[PDB]
Structure 1
Amino acid sequence: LEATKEDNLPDWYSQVITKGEMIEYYDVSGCYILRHWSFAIWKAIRNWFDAEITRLGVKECYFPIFVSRAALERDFAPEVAWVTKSGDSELAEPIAVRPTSETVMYPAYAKWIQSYRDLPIRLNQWNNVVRWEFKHPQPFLRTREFLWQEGHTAFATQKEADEEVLTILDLYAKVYTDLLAIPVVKGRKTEKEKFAGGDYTTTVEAYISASGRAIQGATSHHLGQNFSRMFDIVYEHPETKEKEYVFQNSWGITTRTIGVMIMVHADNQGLVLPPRVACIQVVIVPCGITATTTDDERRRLYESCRELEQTFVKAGIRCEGDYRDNYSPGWKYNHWELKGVPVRIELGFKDLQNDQFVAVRRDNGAKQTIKRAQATVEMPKLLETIHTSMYERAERDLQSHTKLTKQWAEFLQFLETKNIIMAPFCGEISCEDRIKAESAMGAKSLCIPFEQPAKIDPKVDKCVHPACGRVAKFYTLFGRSY
């Protein structure tokens, strides 16, 4: 590993994603070959979330990657990738590679709702979407093609919609903290940062101390009746028949997760995978095989290592051994340290003589010896222990970069000191622009958190800036972002 995380972050990240065997750079700018290592992490995330939402009643479909011009046109216009040509023959009308599927799914929804009896609609797509991002692309954070799931739901009454938005958001937050061991702040986005066609938007924000910047981890919007008016998704009331518009929601999460994991956990020696998503959770690395190693002893070692690995598998542990005779044990140590496998097993001849083995943690590198009887009990403890110690390590990190203040001056102080700031705010868009302006790379709104620091005292509290709406409507989290 060539670069360090603290000095020269972009090339630390590059080094990690390549020497960790998750990326291969690709000759269409801003898209990246996904290797087995990364893709398994995405599979773990995808599988948990789909089990969750299929338990809830969301069904799965798939709309085509292509969107007609006419479909799309009824403004992110500069972000649309256009097929214009089939080979050498130029196309009558161009077709667009999808960025999202509202334009295609909501007309379908108008067609599928023939009566009140057809509601609710709860569909989800696991697909890939292409946005010709103008902002600097980063290998997992912002790729021009990315894989995600997008769910679009239609409801009779607004209660169902509000409840599902929050349900999905709790799911998203659990993906972050329970799968990837990352702390996140749940909140509402301001009127400036909400999804334009929506009503309100929930988010799950995370903070990179390295970058000093925060990043949106997923979104769950409540669309209200905005789109159902746009696309005329209506039904007649069963009693007192009158044209009623349905209530909608949409939500999404992407491979950005992997990037956020990297940024939060990887150290200066490679990746550090959260145990619950790591492809290989335990790797056994046989050692002690000197020059004078009688081939019977090398076979005996290999036999015991394979027996240990499979008794791990039977106890539900993703464990593999590394028995390649072309590499030294120390080489194997480094290799798997870059791949960030949570626990390495060291099984030498002396450990064999004692019916034990030594486990080494990828975070903090602590060694600890374990007898082979307790293998199926200690090892899962250790995996959970690692998860917690990762999450807490990051959570304390977040808590040390969040400062609360009611003054602009020390707001700017904090912002320059590489941390994000909780301050009272009016919410007004003009003022939010003024804050970002006078902070320059300037300070953006992250979300209005669900957990407020204090109740706002209306006779006292004021906004964090000079003109505003004056009266503080709530506390908002602000900071530099991705």
Structure 2
Amino acid sequence: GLEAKKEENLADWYSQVITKSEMIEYHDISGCYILRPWAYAIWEAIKDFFDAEIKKLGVENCYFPMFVSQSALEKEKTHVADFAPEVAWVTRSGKTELAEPIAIRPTSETVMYPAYAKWVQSHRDLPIKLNQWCNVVRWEFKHPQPFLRTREFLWQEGHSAFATMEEAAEEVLQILDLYAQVYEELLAIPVVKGRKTEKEKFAGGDYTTTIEAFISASGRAIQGGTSHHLGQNFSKMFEIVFEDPKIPGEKQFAYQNSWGLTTRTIGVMTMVHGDNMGLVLPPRVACVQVVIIPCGEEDKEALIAKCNDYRRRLLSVNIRVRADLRDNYSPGWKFNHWELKGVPIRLEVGPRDMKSCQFVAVRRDTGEKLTVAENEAETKLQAILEDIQVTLFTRASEDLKTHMVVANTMEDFQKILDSGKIVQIPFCGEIDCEDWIKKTTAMGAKSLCIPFKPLCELQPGAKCVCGKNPAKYYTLFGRSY
């Protein structure tokens, strides 16, 4: 049973939920966590969806080495200056020191792009569109949090190279829309699409697009996925070049994008939908969508037979169902065990209901008990699974809609901010003003994104909240992971 309240001590609740659902185990080392099968199945669902979608775009899977040389890692000064502090270095095998230290990848730009330079000889070799599903390492010394912010994590990283800027800019937004679909369609989490400010953009890229989610329980926002236009910054450094088809002998540098999505997804799901009885799984990603549980000697065998009847009908219509007919456990124990793991529907079959040709469906999101005729089993349960998905999104949506507001001045900005909300404010865009906002609001508020579709229209002559410069865009600010 769960023993911490989400609205009292959030960290204690998070720990409780992820371990009692059997999603996470703690490793010997700190900041390193084990994805047990209940969590990993959510990641596999995401992968199935996203992998099919990127295949539709022409992207292909590959696998690049986990180690990068010192020379490659250093070639793009801004990138390396941003990542160097947290790069992990291997220096020996056994007692034998290596010829040269080698780095574990924090991101794959510098392991892939010498190869791209090799593969791109002429215009017809482009575009190159590659993806890999792998693990990466960001050995920061700050406090790690399972799923949300870890030292090793699983992700997908895509890397594309194009002959023209237009193709590249188009892919950036196609990928970002896919990420939005993962969050909203699969995990029932609303997200805000936007661009990162100059201070928060990917080091070495030209611009970064992103989706931001809101964790109401802590009043904080978190980046869910990211899609960069790197432009020609990396291709100039790695010499990914092709001869201009029109102008003899002129070399052109490829235009590049990279884009990433991680198991942070599962953490957000958990923070957004979890409750005080445990995890709550959106049906669209649930490993088990329905769990059949008997309640209450010809009658005992008839009851288990009926349970099986329900299992086979639900499987017949492609609903993911488990019948927990274990005799080694109590029915109430089974109830709690599967509520903790977040199974969308509990299907209870007891003797009275069975002789009456009905069963009970219990929704996880609301706890509501429905009695359903045996006749309707497949149809109604399908309906209910869809309602759960919608309900989960709707509630989360309402939270976003009440916790993201507009503020045109610094005083109202501060007041709103420490009520636990995020705030769209008119912003001039300068790094100096962003730093100043951070300290004056101190955790201090960071920039989250410049919304594609902001709440209000910026009006002519609007000044930034610093008063010094004119406003360039409504920008979403808040406390962040």
Alignment TM-score, normalising by the size of structure 2: 0.97
* Matching residue's letter, 1:199: D
- Pairwise mapping of residues 236-251 of structure 1 onto structure 2 (< 5 A)? 236-241=243-248, 242-251=250-259
- Pairwise mapping of residues 259-338 of structure 1 onto structure 2 (< 5 A)? 259-288=267-296, 294=297, 296-338=298-340
What corresponds to 1:180 in structure 2?
187
Q: Distance in 1 between the 2:307 and 2:135 partners?
A: 41
What corresponds to 1:56 in structure 2?
57
* Matching residue's letter, 2:102: I
Q: Is the 8 A contact 1:347 1:358 kept in 2?
A: yes
Cα displacement (A) at 1:133:
2.1
Cα displacement (A) at 1:314:
1.3
What corresponds to 1:385 in structure 2?
387
Q: Distance in 2 between the 1:275 and 1:364 partners?
A: 14
RMSD over aligned CA atoms reads 1.0
| 1:170 counterpart (162, 177, 190) | 177
What corresponds to 1:220 in structure 2?
227
Cα displacement (A) at 1:66:
1.5
* Matching residue's letter, 2:269: M
Classify the secondary structure of the residue corresponding to 1:210. Answer: helix
* Matching residue's letter, 1:396: E
Q: Distance in 2 between the 1:30 and 1:432 partners?
A: 30
Classify the secondary structure of the residue corresponding to 1:227. Answer: helix
Q: Distance in 1 between the 2:189 and 2:65 partners?
A: 34
- 1:234 is the counterpart of 2:241: yes
Q: Distance in 2 between the 1:120 and 1:330 partners?
A: 58
Cα displacement (A) at 1:302:
1.0
- Farther-moved stretch of structure 1 (396-405 vs 179-188): 396-405
* Matching residue's letter, 1:441: M
Classify the secondary structure of the residue corresponding to 1:373. Answer: helix
Structure 1: runs of 5+ lacking an equivalent = 289-293
| 1:374 counterpart (367, 373, 376) | 376
Q: Distance in 2 between the 1:330 and 1:58 partners?
A: 48
- 1:93 is the counterpart of 2:100: yes
What corresponds to 1:361 in structure 2?
363
Q: Distance in 1 between the 2:315 and 2:358 partners?
A: 18
User: What's the CA shift string for 1:25-54, capped at 9, x where partnerless?
Assistant: 001110111111000000001110001001
Q: Distance in 2 between the 1:245 and 1:275 partners?
A: 46
Cα displacement (A) at 1:297:
1.8
Q: Distance in 2 between the 1:192 and 1:348 partners?
A: 61
What corresponds to 1:204 in structure 2?
211
User: What's the CA shift string for 1:158-189, capped at 9, x where partnerless?
Assistant: 11111100000000001001000001000000
Classify the secondary structure of the residue corresponding to 1:395. Answer: helix
Q: Distance in 2 between the 1:106 and 1:82 partners?
A: 20
- 1:474 is the counterpart of 2:473: yes
Cα displacement (A) at 1:458:
2.3
User: What's the CA shift string for 1:288-342, capped at 9, x where partnerless?
Assistant: 1xxxxx2x32221111111211210110100011111122211111110000000
What corresponds to 1:456 in structure 2?
458
Cα displacement (A) at 1:134:
2.3
Cα displacement (A) at 1:201:
0.6
Q: Distance in 1 between the 2:459 and 2:406 partners?
A: 16
User: What's the CA shift string for 1:355-391, capped at 9, x where partnerless?
Assistant: 2211000111011111222112111111110001011
What corresponds to 2:44 in structure 1?
43
- 1:255 is the counterpart of 2:254: no
Cα displacement (A) at 1:466:
3.1
Q: Distance in 2 between the 1:403 and 1:223 partners?
A: 32
Q: Distance in 1 between the 2:264 and 2:135 partners?
A: 13
| 2:147 counterpart (140, 157, 182) | 140
Classify the secondary structure of the residue corresponding to 1:223. Answer: strand
What corresponds to 1:291 in structure 2?
none
Classify the secondary structure of the residue corresponding to 2:175. Answer: helix
Classify the secondary structure of the residue corresponding to 2:408. Answer: coil
Q: Is the 8 A contact 2:65 2:111 kept in 1?
A: no
Q: Is the 8 A contact 1:176 1:184 kept in 2?
A: yes
User: What's the CA shift string for 1:122-181, capped at 9, x where partnerless?
Assistant: 000010111102221001001111000000000111111111000000000010010000
User: What's the CA shift string for 1:258-315, capped at 9, x where partnerless?
Assistant: 0001000100110000111011000001001xxxxx2x32221111111211210110
Q: Distance in 1 between the 2:479 and 2:351 partners?
A: 53
Q: Is the 8 A contact 1:199 1:222 kept in 2?
A: yes
* Matching residue's letter, 1:87: G
Q: Is the 8 A contact 1:223 1:249 kept in 2?
A: yes
Q: Is the 8 A contact 1:458 1:471 kept in 2?
A: no
Cα displacement (A) at 1:402:
1.1
- Sequence identity percentage: 67
Classify the secondary structure of the residue corresponding to 1:106. Answer: helix
Q: Distance in 1 between the 2:354 and 2:151 partners?
A: 51
Cα displacement (A) at 1:423:
0.9
Classify the secondary structure of the residue corresponding to 1:18. Answer: helix
Q: Is the 8 A contact 1:284 1:305 kept in 2?
A: yes
- How many residues end up aligned between the 2 structures? 473
* Matching residue's letter, 2:155: W
Q: Distance in 2 between the 1:452 and 1:261 partners?
A: 24
Q: Distance in 2 between the 1:14 and 1:452 partners?
A: 35
Classify the secondary structure of the residue corresponding to 2:252. Answer: strand
Q: Distance in 2 between the 1:70 and 1:462 partners?
A: 46
Q: Distance in 2 between the 1:341 and 1:79 partners?
A: 38
Q: Distance in 1 between the 2:455 and 2:137 partners?
A: 39
Q: Is the 8 A contact 1:346 1:357 kept in 2?
A: yes
* Matching residue's letter, 1:62: Y
Q: Distance in 2 between the 1:421 and 1:228 partners?
A: 37
* Matching residue's letter, 1:169: L
What corresponds to 2:134 in structure 1?
127
- 1:161 is the counterpart of 2:168: yes
Q: Distance in 2 between the 1:442 and 1:409 partners?
A: 14
Structure 2: runs of 5+ lacking an equivalent = 76-80
Cα displacement (A) at 1:456:
2.2
